[PDB]
Write an enzyme that holds these catalytic residues in place. Structure first.
Site, short mmCIF file in Angstrom:
data_model
loop_
_atom_site.label_atom_id
_atom_site.label_comp_id
_atom_site.label_asym_id
_atom_site.label_seq_id
_atom_site.Cartn_x
_atom_site.Cartn_y
_atom_site.Cartn_z
N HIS A 151 -33.04 -50.32 67.32
CA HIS A 151 -32.54 -51.68 67.14
C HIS A 151 -32.02 -52.28 68.45
CE1 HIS A 151 -28.53 -49.75 66.50
NE2 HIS A 151 -27.99 -50.95 66.67
N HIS A 193 -29.23 -53.27 69.91
CA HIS A 193 -27.82 -53.25 70.24
C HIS A 193 -27.71 -52.38 71.49
CE1 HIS A 193 -25.67 -54.42 66.18
NE2 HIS A 193 -26.20 -55.45 66.82
N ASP A 237 -26.07 -49.90 72.43
CA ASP A 237 -26.11 -48.44 72.27
C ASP A 237 -27.47 -47.82 71.99
OD1 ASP A 237 -25.67 -49.74 69.71
OD2 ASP A 237 -25.37 -47.77 68.79
N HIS A 284 -28.02 -52.67 58.80
CA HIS A 284 -26.99 -52.68 59.85
C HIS A 284 -27.28 -53.89 60.73
CE1 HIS A 284 -24.72 -51.89 63.42
NE2 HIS A 284 -25.82 -51.70 64.12
N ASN A 304 -19.80 -53.08 62.94
CA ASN A 304 -20.13 -54.49 63.14
C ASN A 304 -21.10 -54.98 62.07
OD1 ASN A 304 -21.55 -56.87 63.86
ND2 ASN A 304 -21.02 -56.58 66.02
#
Ligand SMILES: [Zn+2]
EC number: 3.5.2.6
Length: 217
Positions: A76, A78, A80, A139, A170
């Site tokens: 994804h 993000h 991280d 998510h 989040n």
């Protein structure tokens, strides 16, 4: 077997012969990814929070296995997971991702990943078999999961919360309501899950999905 740097911010643990889990601390929260040792190079699932940690993770992994990281699967958009994108492309590393992850990576100011993964994509690196699946929104809008058919290991990413994690994290980018549907598809899709690696936390089992559906209730 758990090797790590001198600082403690980057560690790699072994799940099985060719499957290891890498973990880096950032914004400090631990984020995991996989490191697959193949006959034809190393394949990572997810980079790290930034290019510094991503580079180091890569430097580390390659020195240990004496192989080059040829591919990385971005689950994804993000920091991280795709945070070390600029690094992967200056080192000739192929960063696969769904088209959606790619367009959202560009949106968040990250260098664009490959955007080649389809809802269902089976990659085979030498001996290692990998499958990426897009269960739907959860998510985040683009999150996908990785399935290693030979080890029946599921990387749920941040779609799956850990055993003692009582927060969804989040959810500003999350689709809290569809999240549950998405875990059902993963559950329905893979009927013999053994291990499950969460986005943050310890390796668990199919129980981690049920736990997440519980926090979503
Ligand atoms: Zn995320």
């Amino acid at each position: 077997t758990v090797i790590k740097n001198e600082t403690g911010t980057i560690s790699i643990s072994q799940l099985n012969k060719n499957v290891w889990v890498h973990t880096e601390l950032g914004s400090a929260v631990p984020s995991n990814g996989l490191v697959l040792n193949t006959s034809k190079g190393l394949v990572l699932v997810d980079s790290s929070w930034d290019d510094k940690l991503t580079k180091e993770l890569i430097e580390m992994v390659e020195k240990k296995f004496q192989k080059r990281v040829t591919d990385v699967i971005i689950t994804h958009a993000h920091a991280d997971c795709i945070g070390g994108i600029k690094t992967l492309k200056e080192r000739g590393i192929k960063a696969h991702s769904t088209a959606l992850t790619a367009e959202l990576a560009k949106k968040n100011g990250y260098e664009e990943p490959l955007g080649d993964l389809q809802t269902v994509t089976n990659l085979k690196f030498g001996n290692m078999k990998v499958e990426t699946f897009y269960p739907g929104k959860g998510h985040t809008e683009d999150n996908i999961v990785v399935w290693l058919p030979q080890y029946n290991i599921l990387v749920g990413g941040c779609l799956v919360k850990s055993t003692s994690a009582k927060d969804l994290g989040n959810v500003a980018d999350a689709y809290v309501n569809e999240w549950s549907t998405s875990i059902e598809n993963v559950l329905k899709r893979y009927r013999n899950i053994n291990a499950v690696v969460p986005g943050h936390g310890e390796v668990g089992d199919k129980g981690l999905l049920l736990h997440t559906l519980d926090l979503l209730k």
